Amino acid sequence: MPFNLKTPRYGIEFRSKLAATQFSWASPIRRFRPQEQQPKAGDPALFLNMVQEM
Amino acid sequence: AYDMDGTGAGSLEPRGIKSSAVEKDSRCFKVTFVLPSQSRLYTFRELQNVYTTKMVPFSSWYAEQQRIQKMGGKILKVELVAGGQMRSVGNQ
């Protein structure tokens, strides 16, 4: 890993302690994936990323 | 569904009290009575209040009034608090 992508400007231990004054953002909405389209154990759709690396 | 479907003597269902209430009747009285136990001196259950004033549906007043009389009780007052008098339809 490159070191600028290893150690950023601040870590998880400085960000989590200031969630009252600073770093209060709450996160926007993700793209809505329906729950019944998600793969379960024994589905061949969990190996399509393996097949595209062939 | 109602107690007056023709069941009388010589039928398969045992003889009981028959009411003149319609299906899902909604008339209720307001009664007052005293009903002693007359059996506590050989069962020895706890003592209970026997002076009662309660609202009883029209569908059960013939059986309740007939039960209070068999068991020595005395009915002190009865009034109709819900429902119309001599109404043809609209008792449901």
Binding site: - | A1, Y2, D3, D5, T7, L12, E13, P14, G16, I17, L35, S37, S39, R45, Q48, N49, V50, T52, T53, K54, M55, V56, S59, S60, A63, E64, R67, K70, M71
Partner: protein
């Protein structure tokens, strides 16, 4: 599950209806027949009703045939009315004891 019979409770807390009248309108309710009338046959409904409105089991064969015939002819409310309007209920429970 958060069920509630709100008009029945205020009438029984105030004294307008007794506990016998509270139990009777809980038998002919919709929550009761949804749970103890629909998923069962008429034979099993007569036996479970004796456990809820009388606190005991059927004793004889002529006692089943008398109450099976009432349920078969008048449904749920014709059965629950015949159990609370009986002398055995008032003997053990007189208008105020659950």
């Amino acid at each position: 599950y958060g069920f509630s019979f709100s008009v029945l409770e205020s009438q029984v807390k105030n004294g307008q209806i007794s506990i016998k009248e509270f139990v009777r309108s809980l038998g002919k309710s919709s929550v009761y027949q949804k749970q103890f009338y629909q998923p069962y046959v008429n034979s099993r409904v007569v036996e479970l009703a004796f456990r809820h409105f009388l606190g005991r089991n059927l004793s004889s064969l002529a006692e089943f045939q008398k109450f099976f015939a009432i349920l078969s002819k008048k449904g749920l409310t014709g059965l629950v009315d015949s159990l609370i309007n009986s002398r055995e209920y008032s003997d053990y429970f007189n208008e105020e004891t659950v």
